[PDB]
């Protein structure tokens, strides 16, 4: 029940904090416990009765943001360790699952139809564990995470799961102001995203539904100074997000967030000749009259 899940979480935090003081001989065995538990909760059925990934989210949320409300009576230095073990276990799970398309995208199908469900369970799980508590913990992770995800995405293009993780990492990088001076790691990750944005922009023209929404979400999560140099290439992605947003409301949300970021930070004269086609597709949202749509 609730208020017993808090007791289970204080138990797990006490075990990790107990063996985190035993040197680096057992500090290694925080990693494989977090890894084995993440594989365990990422092999449920895809969304007495069966639980899914949605129930372990408060567990892994209290694990990575509630050492402060626990250690301060237990008779940030553990939050950081558990965050690092979570990100290591995420990209360790990514570099081991079998995601290969078999001719049964006409009718391509997974060679490992159990590893694919585990990967997509991992994606929808990790979409709500990483965006909290990024203000220092993700900043040494940005380049390595994004580099590994781009190389896994280049050889698995039609995946709809690597663009979601890439949208997560670029949103977490924008939340901590990563691209400001553009540190050899910051410019390398910058130029990496500059090239990968154009690559995903060209390969999404063949995509249809959730591949298309995933690539659109990734492209409109990109920072302004990566878009500020190639605005005419990203503007049709904004028009397509404002058009697909009439039936998919998260895509209208990422389109409105993209446009409010562009109109504030991108310059006023490079943005000026593009409102003539950005703004007319907002007219579909202003079709409310409260008649039988009350």
């Amino acid at each position: 029940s609730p208020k017993m899940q808090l007791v289970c979480c204080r138990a797990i935090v006490k075990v990790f904090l107990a063996l985190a003081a035993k040197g680096p001989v057992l500090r290694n065995c925080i990693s494989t416990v977090v890894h084995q538990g993440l594989i365990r909760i990422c092999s449920k059925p895809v969304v007495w009765k069966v639980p899914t990934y949605k129930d372990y989210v408060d567990l892994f949320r209290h694990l990575l943001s509630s050492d402060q409300m626990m250690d301060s009576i237990l008779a940030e230095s553990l939050n950081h360790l558990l965050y690092d073990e979570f990100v290591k276990s995420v990209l360790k799970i990514v570099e081991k699952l079998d995601l290969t398309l078999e001719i049964q995208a006409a009718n391509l199908h997974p060679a490992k139809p159990k590893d694919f469900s585990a990967f997509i369970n991992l994606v929808e799980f990790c979409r709500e564990i990483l965006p909290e508590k990024q203000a220092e913990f993700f900043e040494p992770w940005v380049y390595s995470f994004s580099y590994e995800l781009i190389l896994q995405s280049t050889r698995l293009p039609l995946i709809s799961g690597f663009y979601k993780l890439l949208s997560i990492t670029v949103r977490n990088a924008k939340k901590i102001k990563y691209f400001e001076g553009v540190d050899p790691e910051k410019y390398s990750c910058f130029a990496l995203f500059v090239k990968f944005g154009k690559e995903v922009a060209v390969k999404m023209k063949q995509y249809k539904d959730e591949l298309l929404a995933s690539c659109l979400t990734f492209l409109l999560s990109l920072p302004h100074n990566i878009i500020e140099l190639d605005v005419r290439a990203y503007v049709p992605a904004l028009q397509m997000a404002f058009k697909l947003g009439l039936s998919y409301t998260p895509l209208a949300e990422v389109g409105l967030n993209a446009l409010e970021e562009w109109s504030i930070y991108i310059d006023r004269h490079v943005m000026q000749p593009y409102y003539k086609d950005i703004l007319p597709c907002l007219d579909g949202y202003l079709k409310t009259s409260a008649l039988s749509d009350e």
Partner: protein
């Protein structure tokens, strides 16, 4: 190493990639040549010393960045690419240098191997024999580190078997060749961690190798075998630690005898010297019970993964030694996983091995010899595949019938008990074999019917079934008058014989009524009976409405009478006879009808037959006119096993009320006075202070009067006595108000004037409950009853 090394840590990675590309071009040596003496590289050992010395402070604790570790692995791959460097790297691994963060110790070589672990293992698998020799040369000096490194190398060479499968066998052979160099580990007075490191090393070897553990050849076998025997036969270890030398007993239960006798010998010594004294007497939760259960789970894992007679016999001896072992469902699950494994030859080995446990003499007890068949062999025979069940059958036919035709010895009770137990076990084996075999290879001209006679034969195939049916019938239709030695064992034997008769008749007879000739035929003028020989006519049965443990399910709910071990196959045959082939009642029902509807039959037979009619009521629902008088006779009878509205009477009246529209008791006056006595009994015993039971009794009585409603006299004098209590502190008047609400709910009048209450006095004691204003359930319920009665009397004037 630090937080700003990003302008000076970007150039070391560049020269590392440059020198890796040189080494790929084959000219790393020409640009960076050996400025050292013979074999070490002056740059390579400088790199290795750099990476090793820069993880410790000579400056509090250098915590590695995410790129600090990847630069360190690149520097380490370059140092190993320069050449040589196996000896210095091994001597750095086995270095007893001690560190400290802030106090904790954690040796320097262990932290170095824990950080990198994979470049090091890739190197140590790249130059093998020198690594293993120089690593097992220093086994006594640092016994923890050599075990850690050899385990890491061995399970890292397991995972690379998709391409380097030849490397694992080479590493296993070379690590076995130096097994004398670790003989100080599995010795007397050794610490337990080195004894467990031997077991882990042996587990990884035996995972990566094959022909070491199960041959008598290849050379290295005696040295590993005495290691294993001395580790699992010692006293100085602990029982749950010695349980972890049992999970790799799969690798050794395939070697032929001589040594397999020694393996049985050390296992039997472990059982008689570590397991509880034959009756699981360790109280559950103590440190003895814990180690016992976790050892036996790994033992069953070994038995279910490597199916062998040497383990099955031993676990069946420890399972079938007392009345009920702790882990019953575990033993049954292990046997069910033993049977269905393919390989139609090795199942019959298990069947013969566990049959020989109760076939031979070895005199222990009755229950011990019957539990060999009961808890193990029937589980095996019920799930082994159909092809492996005819070989066991043909092997046991002759000795089975030779035991079944014998005469007992009532002078001596012990061999009499053994003969009863053996004959009952043979009846159980024949039961299951007749159950799960098709009719052709048991009744047509086939090898099984040939094998009871000499060679083959020309007969149409009825020379086994007849000599078995006569034996079964002569078994379950015995008759004792002065015979009084062993009534329990012989009664269970009667039940097993009757069940084997069921299972033989349900297979080979199909035509009309050969069921009747043996299953439902007694001879009271010769005292040749059935159900008196089946059911214990002495036990007190309870039938409780309420239960402590709910869900007593198997399927048919087992209560006390429903686990009679003859009720479930009887219900099986009765449901069989409904879909194999009005006319009033057949003889297979007329025998039961004459057995059910008599108060001169014992009570337990009547309750047994009643529960049979209950459990299968889709077969008496056609003949409901005849099958409703004796059930109602038992429900409204005098003796039923309980002093209230118990579960048996609730069950009978629920089934009979389901039979409404098919047989109402308005036809004969006998069933009418039974129905009136039933209603008076139900209305007398309603209350039972648990309120859900009270509401259930009221719903029963309401559905009873609603269903029949015609041939009933409402006991108005009882209801008057039920609400007429002049005490304004008791809910005792609520029961009469509830019964009055029931009888007013359908159509029925209040106060038929025959009951001698003189209606003024009746209705005054009824309406007097309105003044009892303490509990709502008295005065408001009385008010609502008076409202219903007044609407009634206004409605029909």
């Amino acid at each position: 190493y630090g937080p700003d090394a990003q302008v000076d840590r970007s150039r070391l990675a560049a020269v590392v990639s440059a020198c890796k590309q040189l080494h790929r071009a084959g000219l790393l040596h020409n640009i960076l040549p050996s400025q050292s003496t013979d074999l070490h590289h002056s740059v390579g050992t400088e790199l290795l010393s750099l990476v090793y010395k820069g993880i410790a402070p000579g400056q509090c604790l250098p915590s590695l960045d995410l790129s600090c570790k990847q630069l360190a692995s690149g520097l380490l791959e370059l140092a190993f690419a320069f050449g040589g460097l196996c000896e210095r790297l091994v001597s750095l691994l086995l270095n007893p240098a001690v560190l400290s963060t802030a106090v904790i110790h954690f040796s320097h070589g262990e932290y170095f191997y824990s950080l990198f672990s994979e470049t090091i293992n890739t190197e140590l698998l790249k130059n093998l024999d020198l690594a293993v020799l120089e690593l097992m040369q220093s086994s006594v000096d640092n016994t923890k580190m050599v075990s850690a490194v050899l385990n890491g190398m061995l399970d890292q060479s397991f995972r690379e078997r998709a391409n380097q499968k030849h490397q694992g066998l080479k590493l296993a052979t070379t690590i076995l060749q130096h097994w004398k160099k670790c003989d100080s580990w599995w010795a007397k007075d050794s610490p337990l961690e080195t004894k467990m490191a031997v077991l882990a090393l042996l587990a990884k070897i035996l995972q990566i190798d094959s022909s070491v553990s199960f041959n008598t050849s290849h050379g290295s076998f005696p040295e590993v075998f005495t290691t294993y025997i001395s580790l699992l036969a010692d006293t100085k270890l602990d029982l749950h630690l010695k349980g972890q030398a049992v999970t790799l007993l799969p690798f050794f239960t395939s070697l032929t005898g001589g040594s397999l006798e020694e393996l049985r010998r050390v296992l039997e010594q472990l059982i008689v010297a570590h397991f509880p004294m034959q009756s699981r007497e360790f109280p559950p939760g103590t440190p003895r019970f814990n180690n016992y259960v976790d050892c036996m789970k790994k033992f069953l894992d070994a038995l279910e993964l490597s199916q062998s007679p040497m383990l099955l016999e031993l676990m069946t001896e420890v399972l079938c030694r007392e009345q009920q072992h702790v882990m019953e469902e575990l033993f049954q699950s292990s046997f069910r996983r033993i049977a269905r494994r393919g390989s139609c030859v090795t199942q019959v080995g298990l069947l013969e091995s566990v049959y020989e446990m109760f076939r031979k003499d070895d005199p222990r007890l009755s229950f011990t010899r019957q539990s060999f068949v009961d808890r193990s062999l029937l589980t095996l025979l019920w799930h082994c595949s159909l092809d492996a069940l005819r070989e066991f059958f043909s092997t046991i036919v002759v000795d089975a019938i030779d035991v079944l035709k014998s005469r007992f010895t009532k002078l001596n009770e012990s061999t009499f008990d053994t003969q009863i137990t053996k004959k009952m076990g043979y009846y159980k084996i024949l039961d299951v074999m007749y159950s799960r075999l098709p009719k052709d290879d048991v009744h047509a001209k086939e090898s099984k019917i040939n094998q009871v006679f000499h060679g083959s034969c020309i007969t149409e195939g009825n020379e086994l079934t007849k000599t078995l049916i006569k034996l079964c019938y002569d078994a379950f239709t015995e008759n004792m008058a002065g015979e009084n030695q062993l009534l329990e064992r012989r009664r269970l034997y009667h039940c097993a014989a009757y069940n084997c008769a069921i299972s033989v008749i349900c297979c080979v007879f199909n035509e009309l009524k050969f069921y009747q000739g043996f299953l439902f035929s007694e001879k009271p003028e010769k005292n040749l009976l059935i159900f008196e020989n089946l059911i214990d006519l002495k036990r007190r049965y309870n039938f409780p409405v309420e239960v402590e443990v709910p869900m007593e399910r198997k399927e048919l709910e087992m209560d006390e009478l429903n686990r009679h071990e003859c009720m479930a196959p009887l219900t099986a045959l009765v449901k069989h006879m409904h879909r194999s082939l009005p006319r009033d009642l057949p003889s297979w029902m007329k025998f039961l009808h004459g057995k059910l509807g008599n108060p001169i039959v014992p009570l337990n037979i009547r309750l047994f037959l009643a529960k049979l009619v209950i459990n299968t009521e889709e077969v008496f629902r056609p003949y409901a006119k005849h099958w409703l008088s004796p059930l109602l006779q038992l429900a409204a009878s005098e003796n039923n096993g309980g002093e209230g509205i118990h579960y048996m009477v609730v069950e009978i009246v629920a089934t009979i009320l389901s039979w409404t529209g098919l047989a109402t008791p308005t036809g004969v006056p006998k069933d009418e006075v039974l129905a009136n006595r039933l209603l008076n009994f139900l209305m007398k015993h309603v209350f039972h202070p648990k309120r859900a039971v009270f509401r259930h009794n009221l719903e029963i009585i309401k559905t009873l009067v609603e269903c029949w409603k015609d041939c009933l006299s409402i006991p108005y004098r009882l209801i008057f006595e039920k609400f007429s209590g002049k005490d304004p502190n008791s809910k005792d008047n609520s029961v009469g108000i509830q019964l009055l609400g029931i009888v007013m709910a359908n159509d029925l009048p209040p106060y038929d004037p025959q009951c001698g209450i003189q209606s003024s006095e009746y209705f005054q004691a009824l309406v007097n409950n309105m003044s009892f204003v303490r509990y709502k359930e008295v005065y408001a319920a009385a008010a609502e009853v008076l409202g219903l009665i007044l609407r009634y009397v206004m409605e029909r004037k």
